[PDB]
Design a binder for this molecule. Sequence first.
Ligand SMILES: O=C1c2ccc(O)c(O)c2C(=O)c2c(O)ccc(O)c21
Length: 325
Amino acid sequence: SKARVYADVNVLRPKEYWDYEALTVQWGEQDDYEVVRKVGRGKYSEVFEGINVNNNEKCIIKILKPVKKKKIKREIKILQNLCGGPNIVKLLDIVRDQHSKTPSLIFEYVNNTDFKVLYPTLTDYDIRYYIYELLKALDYCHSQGIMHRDVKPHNVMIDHELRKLRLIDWGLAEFYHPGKEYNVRVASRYFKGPELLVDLQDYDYSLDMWSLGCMFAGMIFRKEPFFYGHDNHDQLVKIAKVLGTDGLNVYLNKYRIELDPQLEALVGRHSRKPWLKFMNADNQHLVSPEAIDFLDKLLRYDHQERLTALEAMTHPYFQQVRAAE
Ligand SMILES: O=C1c2ccc(O)c(O)c2C(=O)c2c(O)ccc(O)c21
């Protein structure tokens, strides 16, 4: 398998662009940034609102939990490469504690409106707007030859007050190289593509589009998460109960994958459940044929069949967002 777009980005660029292990970190001043208040956690980190003591500017302080040198270089390089594309978090500085050597990444200040409280109040328009803004971030990073690999509500930081969106936490992200076989232990369960769940290692940018599809499905249907599985096996079962086992079987044949017998047993036999069957009185004001047409083209077993981020932005669903933009 290979990506249908931007396959050759890291083929044509200098090796220095993607060769993150060769990076040597320029450590800034640890004392320049003070913790003001804890604001949350990333995947392998604790995150704080901070202040730059030189100019009193707000910042984000991301203190990383102990991890391998390779992994920190990967995040830092990807962040330097993507500074400052549309709706990407801005890495400002990298510092560390002299004694314990625990590193901190410093970002431009990002405010956070809790998604669990925010999503119920989004209007039909707001969902078109914010997904479009997310799509800009994704098209940009894909065009720079990077997959995010952990798209989810928490990693899409919305400031509803100021109507800003930031794609955050690039700690699971990777450079795309055609044919390369990746670790499937990425993303978060509810937002893991079928490729990850069936051990298809040579995946690409299209992984992020499944994850967005899952977020978009949860928004319009107000069912969150949309696919609510307990473990990785059950997460596939939940997908198969909506999309149907027939489409799964043609997908597994196409890429020549055999399911583990226990997983195959757990998956079983299911019919496709039309998207319209998820509509109810709570979400009717959000579900339109354009929303469903868009969702349908995102939640596809076959990663090659999914809309690219660039294609998605031009779908008539976002027509009013473009026209206003
Ligand atoms: O801004 C980030 C932020 C900015 C860049 C990151 O890499 C990141 O993980 C976070 C982050 O985890 C975070 C959070 O967990 C809670 C509130 C936040 O404002 C953030």
